[PDB]
Each structure stands twice: as structure tokens, then as C-alpha cells.
Amino acid sequence: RFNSSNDERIRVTSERVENMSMRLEEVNEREHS
Amino acid sequence: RFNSSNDERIRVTSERVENMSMRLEEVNEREHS
């Protein structure tokens, strides 16, 4: 019940979005062509 | 009506965010240069 609440889903989504954006910024900053 | 509630949208967004984050981490890990 705890793992499927709205607040937990919003929190985990925010954390993973932040991490994914940071990784994508690193990938884009490292172009070679 | 069921497909357009807030909880369903949050759940779908969370699932796709997790999947996309895993895929982007896999792509970033595999680099040829």
C-alpha cells in the first residue's frame, strides 16, 4: 500500500527525472562529431 | 474516464520514466569513444 501511493510515485518520478536529465546533459556535453 | 484520471496518468508517467532512465543509462554506458 505504501509503495503505490501518489506521493511516493511523485517523489520517485521527480528523482529519476532529475537523474536522467543530468545523465542526458553529460551525454550531450560529450559530442564527438 | 478511467484512462484520464490523475492517478492513472501518474502511474503511467512513473513507469515510462523508469524504463527510459534505465535505457538511457544503458546507452550512456555503451560508448565507442
UniProtKB/Swiss-Prot annotation, chains A, B:
Phenotype caused by lack of the gene: Trpm3-deficient mice exhibit clear deficits in their avoidance to noxious heat. Trpm3-deficient mice display reduced hypersensitivity to thermal, but not to mechanical, stimuli in carrageen-induced inflammatory pain. In the chronic constriction injury (CCI) model of neuropathic pain, intraperitoneal injection of isosakuranetin or primidone do not reduced heat sensitivity in Trpm3-deficient mice.
Subcellular location field: Cell membrane
Subunit structure: Homotetramer. Interacts with TRPM1; the interaction results in the formation of a heteromultimeric cation channel complex that are functionally different from the homomeric channels.
Family the UniProt entry places it in: Belongs to the transient receptor (TC 1.A.4) family. LTrpC subfamily. TRPM3 sub-subfamily.
Function recorded in the entry: Constitutively active, non-selective divalent cation-conducting channel that is permeable to Ca(2+), Mn(2+), and Mg(2+), with a high permeability for Ca(2+). However, can be enhanced by increasing temperature and by ligands, including the endogenous neurosteroid pregnenolone sulfate and sphingosine-1 and suppressed by intracellular Mg(2+). Implicated in a variety of cellular processes, including insulin/peptide secretion, vascular constriction and dilation, noxious heat sensing, inflammatory and spontaneous pain sensitivity.
Descriptive protein name: Transient receptor potential cation channel subfamily M member 3
Native organism taxonomy: Eukaryota, Metazoa, Chordata, Craniata, Vertebrata
Chain's gene name: Trpm3
